[PDB]
Every structure is written in C-alpha cells, then in structure tokens.
mmCIF file of N, CA and C in Angstrom:
data_model
loop_
_atom_site.group_PDB
_atom_site.id
_atom_site.type_symbol
_atom_site.label_atom_id
_atom_site.label_comp_id
_atom_site.label_asym_id
_atom_site.label_seq_id
_atom_site.Cartn_x
_atom_site.Cartn_y
_atom_site.Cartn_z
ATOM 1 N N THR Q 8 17.999 0.981 17.533
ATOM 2 C CA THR Q 8 19.104 0.362 17.423
ATOM 3 C C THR Q 8 18.967 -1.242 16.978
ATOM 4 N N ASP Q 9 18.629 -2.087 17.790
ATOM 5 C CA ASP Q 9 18.086 -3.509 17.507
ATOM 6 C C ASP Q 9 16.601 -3.208 17.361
ATOM 7 N N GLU Q 10 16.145 -2.182 17.750
ATOM 8 C CA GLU Q 10 14.715 -1.710 17.389
ATOM 9 C C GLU Q 10 14.506 -1.353 15.964
ATOM 10 N N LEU Q 11 15.655 -0.410 15.542
ATOM 11 C CA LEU Q 11 15.549 0.170 14.274
ATOM 12 C C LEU Q 11 15.630 -1.194 13.206
ATOM 13 N N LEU Q 12 16.384 -2.122 13.538
ATOM 14 C CA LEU Q 12 16.492 -3.305 12.717
ATOM 15 C C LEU Q 12 15.029 -4.202 12.792
ATOM 16 N N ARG Q 13 14.669 -4.400 13.917
ATOM 17 C CA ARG Q 13 13.318 -5.101 14.194
ATOM 18 C C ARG Q 13 12.178 -4.175 13.192
ATOM 19 N N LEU Q 14 12.064 -3.042 13.362
ATOM 20 C CA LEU Q 14 10.988 -2.101 12.681
ATOM 21 C C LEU Q 14 11.235 -2.325 11.092
ATOM 22 N N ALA Q 15 12.566 -2.236 10.441
ATOM 23 C CA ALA Q 15 12.969 -2.406 9.259
ATOM 24 C C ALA Q 15 12.409 -3.620 8.584
ATOM 25 N N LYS Q 16 12.779 -4.815 9.274
ATOM 26 C CA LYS Q 16 12.302 -6.062 8.847
ATOM 27 C C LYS Q 16 10.719 -6.182 8.850
ATOM 28 N N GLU Q 17 10.041 -5.577 9.823
ATOM 29 C CA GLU Q 17 8.687 -5.585 9.960
ATOM 30 C C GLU Q 17 7.883 -4.801 8.813
ATOM 31 N N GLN Q 18 8.642 -3.667 8.393
ATOM 32 C CA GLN Q 18 8.387 -2.891 7.193
ATOM 33 C C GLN Q 18 8.507 -3.507 5.833
ATOM 34 N N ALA Q 19 9.600 -4.335 5.712
ATOM 35 C CA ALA Q 19 9.749 -4.994 4.491
ATOM 36 C C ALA Q 19 8.774 -6.371 4.359
ATOM 37 N N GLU Q 20 8.456 -6.873 5.460
ATOM 38 C CA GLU Q 20 7.545 -7.996 5.424
ATOM 39 C C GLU Q 20 6.000 -7.356 5.066
ATOM 40 N N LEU Q 21 5.691 -6.220 5.610
ATOM 41 C CA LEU Q 21 4.619 -5.452 5.323
ATOM 42 C C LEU Q 21 4.518 -5.134 3.717
ATOM 43 N N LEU Q 22 5.430 -4.537 3.302
ATOM 44 C CA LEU Q 22 5.615 -4.088 1.925
ATOM 45 C C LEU Q 22 5.340 -5.306 1.002
ATOM 46 N N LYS Q 23 6.111 -6.482 1.478
ATOM 47 C CA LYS Q 23 5.913 -7.657 0.599
ATOM 48 C C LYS Q 23 4.427 -8.211 0.516
ATOM 49 N N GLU Q 24 3.740 -8.184 1.638
ATOM 50 C CA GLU Q 24 2.323 -8.440 1.732
ATOM 51 C C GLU Q 24 1.449 -7.507 0.986
ATOM 52 N N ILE Q 25 1.825 -6.174 1.156
ATOM 53 C CA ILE Q 25 1.022 -5.162 0.358
ATOM 54 C C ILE Q 25 1.286 -5.304 -1.125
ATOM 55 N N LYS Q 26 2.507 -5.379 -1.675
ATOM 56 C CA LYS Q 26 2.727 -5.664 -3.153
ATOM 57 C C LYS Q 26 2.017 -6.883 -3.538
ATOM 58 N N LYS Q 27 1.942 -7.969 -2.901
ATOM 59 C CA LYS Q 27 1.120 -9.095 -3.287
ATOM 60 C C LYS Q 27 -0.299 -8.894 -3.255
ATOM 61 N N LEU Q 28 -0.793 -8.325 -2.197
ATOM 62 C CA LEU Q 28 -2.142 -7.890 -2.248
ATOM 63 C C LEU Q 28 -2.837 -7.046 -3.247
ATOM 64 N N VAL Q 29 -1.822 -5.986 -3.663
ATOM 65 C CA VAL Q 29 -2.219 -4.970 -4.894
ATOM 66 C C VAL Q 29 -2.316 -5.784 -6.177
ATOM 67 N N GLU Q 30 -1.359 -6.678 -6.231
ATOM 68 C CA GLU Q 30 -1.391 -7.425 -7.532
ATOM 69 C C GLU Q 30 -2.647 -8.234 -7.553
ATOM 70 N N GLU Q 31 -3.042 -8.988 -6.384
ATOM 71 C CA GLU Q 31 -4.374 -9.752 -6.303
ATOM 72 C C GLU Q 31 -5.437 -8.843 -6.524
ATOM 73 N N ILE Q 32 -5.570 -7.653 -6.192
ATOM 74 C CA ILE Q 32 -6.667 -6.538 -6.342
ATOM 75 C C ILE Q 32 -6.819 -6.378 -7.820
ATOM 76 N N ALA Q 33 -5.623 -6.042 -8.456
ATOM 77 C CA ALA Q 33 -5.625 -5.727 -9.954
ATOM 78 C C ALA Q 33 -6.219 -7.002 -10.755
ATOM 79 N N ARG Q 34 -5.808 -8.176 -10.329
ATOM 80 C CA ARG Q 34 -6.387 -9.375 -11.189
ATOM 81 C C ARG Q 34 -7.792 -9.457 -10.883
ATOM 82 N N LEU Q 35 -8.352 -9.244 -9.631
ATOM 83 C CA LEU Q 35 -9.846 -9.360 -9.341
ATOM 84 C C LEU Q 35 -10.533 -8.289 -9.983
ATOM 85 N N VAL Q 36 -10.030 -7.018 -10.230
ATOM 86 C CA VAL Q 36 -10.642 -6.040 -10.836
ATOM 87 C C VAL Q 36 -11.012 -6.382 -12.202
ATOM 88 N N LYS Q 37 -10.075 -7.087 -12.970
ATOM 89 C CA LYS Q 37 -10.135 -7.559 -14.207
ATOM 90 C C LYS Q 37 -11.335 -8.378 -14.498
ATOM 91 N N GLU Q 38 -11.333 -9.401 -13.354
ATOM 92 C CA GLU Q 38 -12.459 -10.415 -13.340
ATOM 93 C C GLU Q 38 -13.877 -9.643 -13.237
ATOM 94 N N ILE Q 39 -13.798 -8.562 -12.495
ATOM 95 C CA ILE Q 39 -15.046 -7.745 -12.242
ATOM 96 C C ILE Q 39 -15.696 -7.160 -13.500
ATOM 97 N N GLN Q 40 -14.449 -6.853 -14.152
ATOM 98 C CA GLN Q 40 -14.891 -6.112 -15.571
ATOM 99 C C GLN Q 40 -15.575 -7.259 -16.428
ATOM 100 N N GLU Q 41 -14.999 -8.562 -16.234
ATOM 101 C CA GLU Q 41 -15.856 -9.506 -17.056
ATOM 102 C C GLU Q 41 -17.204 -10.005 -16.349
ATOM 103 N N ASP Q 42 -17.321 -9.905 -15.053
ATOM 104 C CA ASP Q 42 -18.598 -10.287 -14.342
ATOM 105 C C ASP Q 42 -18.769 -9.370 -13.158
ATOM 106 N N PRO Q 43 -19.303 -8.410 -13.255
ATOM 107 C CA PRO Q 43 -19.493 -7.497 -12.026
ATOM 108 C C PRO Q 43 -20.420 -7.999 -10.991
ATOM 109 N N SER Q 44 -20.181 -9.151 -10.417
ATOM 110 C CA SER Q 44 -21.289 -9.862 -9.529
ATOM 111 C C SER Q 44 -21.137 -9.165 -8.185
ATOM 112 N N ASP Q 45 -22.191 -9.291 -7.372
ATOM 113 C CA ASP Q 45 -22.387 -8.898 -6.067
ATOM 114 C C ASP Q 45 -21.169 -9.515 -5.191
ATOM 115 N N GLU Q 46 -20.973 -10.627 -5.308
ATOM 116 C CA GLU Q 46 -19.920 -11.540 -4.475
ATOM 117 C C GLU Q 46 -18.671 -11.146 -4.713
ATOM 118 N N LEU Q 47 -18.246 -10.963 -6.098
ATOM 119 C CA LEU Q 47 -16.833 -10.428 -6.406
ATOM 120 C C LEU Q 47 -16.430 -9.120 -5.977
ATOM 121 N N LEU Q 48 -17.590 -8.292 -5.953
ATOM 122 C CA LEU Q 48 -17.458 -6.784 -5.419
ATOM 123 C C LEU Q 48 -17.289 -6.772 -3.902
ATOM 124 N N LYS Q 49 -17.978 -7.691 -3.260
ATOM 125 C CA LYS Q 49 -17.925 -7.985 -1.874
ATOM 126 C C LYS Q 49 -16.539 -8.363 -1.529
ATOM 127 N N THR Q 50 -15.953 -9.192 -2.201
ATOM 128 C CA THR Q 50 -14.543 -9.720 -2.007
ATOM 129 C C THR Q 50 -13.518 -8.593 -2.132
ATOM 130 N N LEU Q 51 -13.722 -7.712 -3.359
ATOM 131 C CA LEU Q 51 -12.831 -6.761 -3.577
ATOM 132 C C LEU Q 51 -12.983 -5.601 -2.397
ATOM 133 N N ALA Q 52 -14.127 -5.521 -1.877
ATOM 134 C CA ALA Q 52 -14.305 -4.409 -0.768
ATOM 135 C C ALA Q 52 -13.387 -5.006 0.374
ATOM 136 N N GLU Q 53 -13.579 -6.315 0.596
ATOM 137 C CA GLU Q 53 -12.672 -6.886 1.865
ATOM 138 C C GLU Q 53 -11.292 -6.759 1.545
ATOM 139 N N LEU Q 54 -10.851 -7.064 0.236
ATOM 140 C CA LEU Q 54 -9.275 -6.895 0.148
ATOM 141 C C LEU Q 54 -8.739 -5.556 0.384
ATOM 142 N N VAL Q 55 -9.523 -4.412 -0.128
ATOM 143 C CA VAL Q 55 -9.221 -3.081 0.136
ATOM 144 C C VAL Q 55 -9.088 -2.714 1.472
ATOM 145 N N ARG Q 56 -10.197 -3.289 2.368
ATOM 146 C CA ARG Q 56 -10.088 -3.121 3.808
ATOM 147 C C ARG Q 56 -8.880 -3.638 4.329
ATOM 148 N N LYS Q 57 -8.472 -4.793 3.901
ATOM 149 C CA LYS Q 57 -7.260 -5.745 4.408
ATOM 150 C C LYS Q 57 -5.981 -4.702 3.920
ATOM 151 N N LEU Q 58 -6.148 -4.180 2.649
ATOM 152 C CA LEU Q 58 -5.034 -3.373 2.187
ATOM 153 C C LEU Q 58 -4.838 -2.087 3.130
ATOM 154 N N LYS Q 59 -5.810 -1.656 3.417
ATOM 155 C CA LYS Q 59 -5.819 -0.308 4.346
ATOM 156 C C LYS Q 59 -5.103 -0.575 5.628
ATOM 157 N N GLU Q 60 -5.402 -1.706 6.266
ATOM 158 C CA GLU Q 60 -4.757 -2.134 7.514
ATOM 159 C C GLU Q 60 -3.523 -2.320 7.187
ATOM 160 N N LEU Q 61 -2.838 -3.083 6.308
ATOM 161 C CA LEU Q 61 -1.596 -3.218 6.013
ATOM 162 C C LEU Q 61 -0.815 -1.962 5.848
ATOM 163 N N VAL Q 62 -1.523 -0.901 5.144
ATOM 164 C CA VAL Q 62 -0.708 0.340 4.938
ATOM 165 C C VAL Q 62 -0.687 1.188 6.280
ATOM 166 N N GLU Q 63 -1.725 0.945 7.126
ATOM 167 C CA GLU Q 63 -1.717 1.705 8.350
ATOM 168 C C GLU Q 63 -0.649 0.843 9.254
ATOM 169 N N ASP Q 64 -0.550 -0.351 9.199
ATOM 170 C CA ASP Q 64 0.646 -0.907 10.002
ATOM 171 C C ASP Q 64 2.050 -0.580 9.561
ATOM 172 N N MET Q 65 2.194 -0.176 8.126
ATOM 173 C CA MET Q 65 3.456 -0.033 7.748
ATOM 174 C C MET Q 65 3.730 1.370 8.031
ATOM 175 N N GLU Q 66 2.823 2.291 8.120
ATOM 176 C CA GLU Q 66 2.615 3.764 8.513
ATOM 177 C C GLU Q 66 3.212 3.896 9.939
ATOM 178 N N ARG Q 67 2.457 3.172 10.656
ATOM 179 C CA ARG Q 67 2.893 3.079 12.239
ATOM 180 C C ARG Q 67 4.131 2.617 12.537
ATOM 181 N N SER Q 68 4.629 1.684 11.931
ATOM 182 C CA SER Q 68 5.944 1.075 12.067
ATOM 183 C C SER Q 68 6.990 2.206 11.640
ATOM 184 N N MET Q 69 6.854 2.901 10.428
ATOM 185 C CA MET Q 69 7.734 3.982 10.007
ATOM 186 C C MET Q 69 7.815 5.126 10.915
ATOM 187 N N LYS Q 70 6.542 5.400 11.511
ATOM 188 C CA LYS Q 70 6.559 6.632 12.430
ATOM 189 C C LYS Q 70 7.404 6.314 13.768
ATOM 190 N N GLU Q 71 7.164 4.992 14.136
ATOM 191 C CA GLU Q 71 7.899 4.576 15.389
ATOM 192 C C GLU Q 71 9.343 4.789 15.012
ATOM 193 N N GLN Q 72 9.781 4.313 14.041
ATOM 194 C CA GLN Q 72 11.069 4.484 13.531
ATOM 195 C C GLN Q 72 11.548 5.721 13.536
ATOM 196 N N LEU Q 73 10.766 6.721 12.922
ATOM 197 C CA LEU Q 73 11.276 8.067 12.763
ATOM 198 C C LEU Q 73 11.396 8.687 14.252
ATOM 199 N N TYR Q 74 10.416 8.487 15.124
ATOM 200 C CA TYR Q 74 10.561 8.814 16.451
ATOM 201 C C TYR Q 74 11.946 8.448 17.162
ATOM 202 N N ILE Q 75 12.208 7.171 17.046
ATOM 203 C CA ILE Q 75 13.311 6.703 17.494
ATOM 204 C C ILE Q 75 14.559 7.236 17.062
ATOM 205 N N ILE Q 76 14.519 7.370 15.745
ATOM 206 C CA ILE Q 76 15.695 8.198 14.873
ATOM 207 C C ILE Q 76 15.886 9.755 15.430
ATOM 208 N N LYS Q 77 14.727 10.373 15.505
ATOM 209 C CA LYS Q 77 14.702 11.691 15.742
ATOM 210 C C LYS Q 77 15.190 11.833 17.394
ATOM 211 N N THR D 8 22.409 15.164 6.681
ATOM 212 C CA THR D 8 23.273 14.640 7.423
ATOM 213 C C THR D 8 22.975 13.052 7.862
ATOM 214 N N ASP D 9 21.838 12.704 8.348
ATOM 215 C CA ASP D 9 21.358 11.535 8.781
ATOM 216 C C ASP D 9 20.520 10.933 7.613
ATOM 217 N N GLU D 10 21.290 9.889 6.974
ATOM 218 C CA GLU D 10 20.634 9.177 5.915
ATOM 219 C C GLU D 10 19.356 8.308 6.102
ATOM 220 N N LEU D 11 19.443 7.731 7.459
ATOM 221 C CA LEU D 11 18.492 7.028 7.945
ATOM 222 C C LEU D 11 17.125 7.798 7.946
ATOM 223 N N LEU D 12 17.154 8.951 8.570
ATOM 224 C CA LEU D 12 16.115 9.915 8.767
ATOM 225 C C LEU D 12 15.674 10.567 7.276
ATOM 226 N N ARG D 13 16.577 10.705 6.400
ATOM 227 C CA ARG D 13 16.145 10.988 5.145
ATOM 228 C C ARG D 13 15.256 10.052 4.458
ATOM 229 N N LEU D 14 15.554 8.841 4.593
ATOM 230 C CA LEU D 14 15.054 7.842 3.939
ATOM 231 C C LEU D 14 13.713 7.500 4.513
ATOM 232 N N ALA D 15 13.701 7.526 5.788
ATOM 233 C CA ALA D 15 12.477 7.268 6.566
ATOM 234 C C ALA D 15 11.321 8.491 6.156
ATOM 235 N N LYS D 16 11.629 9.608 6.204
ATOM 236 C CA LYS D 16 11.123 10.680 5.753
ATOM 237 C C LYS D 16 10.615 10.474 4.292
ATOM 238 N N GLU D 17 11.492 9.897 3.487
ATOM 239 C CA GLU D 17 11.385 9.505 2.123
ATOM 240 C C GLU D 17 10.511 8.228 1.832
ATOM 241 N N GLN D 18 10.005 7.631 3.063
ATOM 242 C CA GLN D 18 9.018 6.410 2.958
ATOM 243 C C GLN D 18 7.755 6.828 3.454
ATOM 244 N N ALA D 19 7.821 8.129 4.497
ATOM 245 C CA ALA D 19 6.511 8.445 5.068
ATOM 246 C C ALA D 19 5.716 9.077 4.245
ATOM 247 N N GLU D 20 6.367 9.867 3.213
ATOM 248 C CA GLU D 20 5.335 10.663 2.366
ATOM 249 C C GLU D 20 4.744 9.914 1.356
ATOM 250 N N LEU D 21 5.522 8.813 0.912
ATOM 251 C CA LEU D 21 4.976 7.793 -0.135
ATOM 252 C C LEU D 21 3.943 7.075 0.430
ATOM 253 N N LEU D 22 3.956 6.649 1.702
ATOM 254 C CA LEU D 22 2.880 5.975 2.257
ATOM 255 C C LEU D 22 1.553 6.727 2.567
ATOM 256 N N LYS D 23 1.916 8.008 3.027
ATOM 257 C CA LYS D 23 0.877 9.118 3.099
ATOM 258 C C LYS D 23 0.116 9.185 1.858
ATOM 259 N N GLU D 24 0.825 9.252 0.686
ATOM 260 C CA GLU D 24 0.025 9.275 -0.678
ATOM 261 C C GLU D 24 -0.486 7.963 -0.947
ATOM 262 N N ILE D 25 0.048 6.869 -0.717
ATOM 263 C CA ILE D 25 -0.697 5.496 -0.843
ATOM 264 C C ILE D 25 -1.859 5.267 0.046
ATOM 265 N N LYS D 26 -1.772 5.848 1.419
ATOM 266 C CA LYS D 26 -2.925 5.760 2.075
ATOM 267 C C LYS D 26 -4.166 6.525 1.507
ATOM 268 N N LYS D 27 -3.778 7.760 1.003
ATOM 269 C CA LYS D 27 -4.818 8.606 0.230
ATOM 270 C C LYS D 27 -5.573 7.768 -0.809
ATOM 271 N N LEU D 28 -4.786 7.381 -1.655
ATOM 272 C CA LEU D 28 -5.128 6.559 -2.977
ATOM 273 C C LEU D 28 -5.952 5.257 -2.581
ATOM 274 N N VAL D 29 -5.505 4.628 -1.554
ATOM 275 C CA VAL D 29 -6.199 3.333 -0.911
ATOM 276 C C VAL D 29 -7.591 3.874 -0.462
ATOM 277 N N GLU D 30 -7.743 4.824 0.311
ATOM 278 C CA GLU D 30 -8.985 5.414 0.697
ATOM 279 C C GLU D 30 -9.953 5.809 -0.498
ATOM 280 N N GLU D 31 -9.137 6.410 -1.461
ATOM 281 C CA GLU D 31 -9.963 6.785 -2.632
ATOM 282 C C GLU D 31 -10.499 5.576 -3.405
ATOM 283 N N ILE D 32 -9.690 4.466 -3.398
ATOM 284 C CA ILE D 32 -10.190 3.274 -4.106
ATOM 285 C C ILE D 32 -11.248 2.567 -3.415
ATOM 286 N N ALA D 33 -11.236 2.579 -2.111
ATOM 287 C CA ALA D 33 -12.314 2.075 -1.171
ATOM 288 C C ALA D 33 -13.635 2.876 -1.585
ATOM 289 N N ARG D 34 -13.690 4.192 -1.456
ATOM 290 C CA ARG D 34 -14.821 4.867 -1.816
ATOM 291 C C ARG D 34 -15.219 4.558 -3.151
ATOM 292 N N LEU D 35 -14.468 4.471 -4.147
ATOM 293 C CA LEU D 35 -14.837 4.080 -5.515
ATOM 294 C C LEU D 35 -15.486 2.839 -5.581
ATOM 295 N N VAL D 36 -14.942 1.629 -4.820
ATOM 296 C CA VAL D 36 -15.387 0.364 -5.004
ATOM 297 C C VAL D 36 -16.994 0.465 -4.400
ATOM 298 N N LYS D 37 -17.281 1.139 -3.354
ATOM 299 C CA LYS D 37 -18.538 1.470 -2.795
ATOM 300 C C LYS D 37 -19.313 1.998 -3.873
ATOM 301 N N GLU D 38 -19.090 3.026 -4.705
ATOM 302 C CA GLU D 38 -19.792 3.415 -5.823
ATOM 303 C C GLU D 38 -20.071 2.371 -6.737
ATOM 304 N N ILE D 39 -19.072 1.623 -7.155
ATOM 305 C CA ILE D 39 -19.220 0.493 -8.300
ATOM 306 C C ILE D 39 -20.212 -0.455 -7.747
ATOM 307 N N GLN D 40 -20.257 -0.822 -6.442
ATOM 308 C CA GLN D 40 -21.250 -1.662 -5.902
ATOM 309 C C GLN D 40 -22.675 -1.011 -6.176
ATOM 310 N N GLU D 41 -22.685 0.243 -6.313
ATOM 311 C CA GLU D 41 -23.937 0.782 -6.595
ATOM 312 C C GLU D 41 -24.351 0.990 -8.059
ATOM 313 N N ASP D 42 -23.429 1.231 -8.785
ATOM 314 C CA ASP D 42 -23.307 1.212 -10.328
ATOM 315 C C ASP D 42 -22.202 0.712 -10.916
ATOM 316 N N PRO D 43 -22.006 -0.600 -11.236
ATOM 317 C CA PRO D 43 -20.878 -1.293 -11.678
ATOM 318 C C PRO D 43 -20.642 -1.059 -13.179
ATOM 319 N N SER D 44 -20.441 0.278 -13.691
ATOM 320 C CA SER D 44 -20.384 0.664 -14.971
ATOM 321 C C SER D 44 -18.952 0.472 -15.493
ATOM 322 N N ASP D 45 -18.724 0.276 -16.842
ATOM 323 C CA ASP D 45 -17.597 0.144 -17.438
ATOM 324 C C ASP D 45 -16.469 1.285 -17.057
ATOM 325 N N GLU D 46 -17.081 2.492 -17.037
ATOM 326 C CA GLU D 46 -16.369 3.649 -16.910
ATOM 327 C C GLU D 46 -15.828 3.754 -15.555
ATOM 328 N N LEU D 47 -16.505 3.572 -14.489
ATOM 329 C CA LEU D 47 -16.013 3.446 -13.041
ATOM 330 C C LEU D 47 -15.010 2.279 -12.846
ATOM 331 N N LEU D 48 -15.247 1.089 -13.556
ATOM 332 C CA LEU D 48 -14.225 0.039 -13.297
ATOM 333 C C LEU D 48 -13.055 0.331 -14.096
ATOM 334 N N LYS D 49 -12.973 1.114 -15.284
ATOM 335 C CA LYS D 49 -11.825 1.629 -15.977
ATOM 336 C C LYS D 49 -11.143 2.496 -15.220
ATOM 337 N N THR D 50 -11.679 3.438 -14.408
ATOM 338 C CA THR D 50 -11.082 4.319 -13.311
ATOM 339 C C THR D 50 -10.587 3.528 -12.405
ATOM 340 N N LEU D 51 -11.173 2.515 -11.770
ATOM 341 C CA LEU D 51 -10.671 1.737 -10.686
ATOM 342 C C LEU D 51 -9.291 1.072 -11.044
ATOM 343 N N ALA D 52 -9.259 0.498 -12.369
ATOM 344 C CA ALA D 52 -8.083 -0.096 -12.877
ATOM 345 C C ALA D 52 -6.938 0.600 -13.057
ATOM 346 N N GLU D 53 -7.268 1.911 -13.407
ATOM 347 C CA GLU D 53 -6.095 3.061 -13.528
ATOM 348 C C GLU D 53 -5.644 3.412 -12.122
ATOM 349 N N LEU D 54 -6.504 3.359 -11.263
ATOM 350 C CA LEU D 54 -6.029 3.959 -9.889
ATOM 351 C C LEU D 54 -5.058 2.813 -9.069
ATOM 352 N N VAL D 55 -5.548 1.431 -9.663
ATOM 353 C CA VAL D 55 -4.733 0.331 -9.042
ATOM 354 C C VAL D 55 -3.444 0.291 -9.659
ATOM 355 N N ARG D 56 -3.287 0.468 -10.870
ATOM 356 C CA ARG D 56 -2.007 0.629 -11.628
ATOM 357 C C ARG D 56 -1.200 1.674 -10.990
ATOM 358 N N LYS D 57 -1.690 2.918 -10.652
ATOM 359 C CA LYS D 57 -1.034 3.869 -9.947
ATOM 360 C C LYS D 57 -0.468 3.495 -8.644
ATOM 361 N N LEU D 58 -1.386 2.683 -7.924
ATOM 362 C CA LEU D 58 -1.098 2.244 -6.763
ATOM 363 C C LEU D 58 0.131 1.139 -6.685
ATOM 364 N N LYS D 59 0.122 0.330 -7.871
ATOM 365 C CA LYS D 59 1.230 -0.551 -7.899
ATOM 366 C C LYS D 59 2.462 0.101 -8.072
ATOM 367 N N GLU D 60 2.623 1.202 -8.939
ATOM 368 C CA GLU D 60 3.821 1.885 -9.114
ATOM 369 C C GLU D 60 4.332 2.640 -7.886
ATOM 370 N N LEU D 61 3.504 3.045 -6.937
ATOM 371 C CA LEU D 61 3.745 3.856 -5.680
ATOM 372 C C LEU D 61 4.500 2.817 -4.770
ATOM 373 N N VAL D 62 3.844 1.487 -4.758
ATOM 374 C CA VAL D 62 4.391 0.341 -3.947
ATOM 375 C C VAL D 62 5.767 -0.031 -4.399
ATOM 376 N N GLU D 63 5.975 -0.064 -5.601
ATOM 377 C CA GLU D 63 7.263 -0.244 -6.377
ATOM 378 C C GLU D 63 8.146 0.812 -6.010
ATOM 379 N N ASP D 64 7.832 2.114 -5.857
ATOM 380 C CA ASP D 64 8.547 3.165 -5.501
ATOM 381 C C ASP D 64 9.095 3.080 -4.213
ATOM 382 N N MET D 65 8.523 2.330 -3.219
ATOM 383 C CA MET D 65 8.964 2.017 -2.016
ATOM 384 C C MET D 65 9.970 1.088 -1.894
ATOM 385 N N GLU D 66 10.169 0.234 -2.932
ATOM 386 C CA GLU D 66 11.118 -0.959 -2.848
ATOM 387 C C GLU D 66 12.569 -0.727 -2.552
ATOM 388 N N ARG D 67 13.093 0.161 -3.494
ATOM 389 C CA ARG D 67 14.604 0.564 -3.368
ATOM 390 C C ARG D 67 14.948 1.168 -2.024
ATOM 391 N N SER D 68 14.039 2.066 -1.630
ATOM 392 C CA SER D 68 14.393 2.747 -0.303
ATOM 393 C C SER D 68 14.223 1.598 0.832
ATOM 394 N N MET D 69 13.329 0.655 0.801
ATOM 395 C CA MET D 69 13.136 -0.083 1.612
ATOM 396 C C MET D 69 14.439 -1.009 1.861
ATOM 397 N N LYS D 70 14.879 -1.487 0.592
ATOM 398 C CA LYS D 70 16.116 -2.345 0.445
ATOM 399 C C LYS D 70 17.358 -1.503 1.074
ATOM 400 N N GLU D 71 17.437 -0.280 0.682
ATOM 401 C CA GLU D 71 18.596 0.573 1.184
ATOM 402 C C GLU D 71 18.482 0.553 2.701
ATOM 403 N N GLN D 72 17.293 0.964 3.366
ATOM 404 C CA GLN D 72 17.156 0.879 4.907
ATOM 405 C C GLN D 72 17.512 -0.149 5.442
ATOM 406 N N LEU D 73 17.367 -1.351 4.761
ATOM 407 C CA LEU D 73 17.575 -2.627 5.455
ATOM 408 C C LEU D 73 19.149 -2.835 5.379
ATOM 409 N N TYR D 74 19.660 -2.463 4.166
ATOM 410 C CA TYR D 74 21.143 -2.642 4.002
ATOM 411 C C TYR D 74 22.003 -1.775 4.809
ATOM 412 N N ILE D 75 21.623 -0.629 4.929
ATOM 413 C CA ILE D 75 22.126 0.330 5.859
ATOM 414 C C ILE D 75 22.028 -0.078 7.465
ATOM 415 N N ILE D 76 20.943 -0.613 7.933
ATOM 416 C CA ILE D 76 20.737 -0.711 9.240
ATOM 417 C C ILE D 76 21.477 -2.169 9.533
ATOM 418 N N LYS D 77 21.321 -3.292 8.716
ATOM 419 C CA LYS D 77 21.967 -4.403 9.092
ATOM 420 C C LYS D 77 23.646 -4.330 9.193
#
C-alpha cells in the first residue's frame, strides 16, 4: 500500500542508477579498446560488480513487491 | 485481472534476463583481463549495447507502475 509506493520509488531510483552505470560502462569499454591497461580493466571489473549489486537490489525490491501484491 | 501484478511479473523476467547478462559480462571481463583481444572486447561492447536495451525496456513499465500506484 504505502509499502507498494515506497518500493516503486525505490525501484525507480535503482533503475536510474543502473541506466547511468551501464552508460558509464559502455564508455569505459570504448576507452579500453583504445588502451587495454590493467588499471582500466580493474576499474571495469569494479563497475560490473557494482552493477550486479544494483540489479540484485532492484530484483529484491520487485520480489518483495510481488509478495505483497500476491 | 491485476495490472500491478502483471507489470511486476513483467519487470521480474526482464531483471532475471538482465542479471544473467550482467553475470556473463562479469565472466567475460575476467577473460579480457587474461587476454585483452580486439575480438573479446568487440563481444563485450555488443553485450553492453544489449544490456542498455534491456534496461530501457524496463523504463516504460517502471513509469507505468509509478503512475498506477501514485
């Protein structure tokens, strides 16, 4: 109810962060194609880990919302 | 009958797909760190473009859910 709204806004903020992060990753991959250094690849690995966390967070929020709806 | 349920189920399968792709990207990055070849980096760039599209696919539904719930 008020929870469904809270969860929806939580998901929207996560989606915003995810979209932004995926765009960042795309640009970094282009840089790495120019210079595949260890440091840039370490950074990319870190961004992908962060991305997985955000996706997990959004999935958990959506599942909780599903539970409440059901 | 329940549109909030329909959409929530229609965001859950997208994220499940996104989660899979993200985990694939993570493993690929690890391989690129071992062999940063042009071919593997071209593949990574393709996977990230596909990821962008899936994230965008979540946008309309997210906005609908928000509109419906508010």
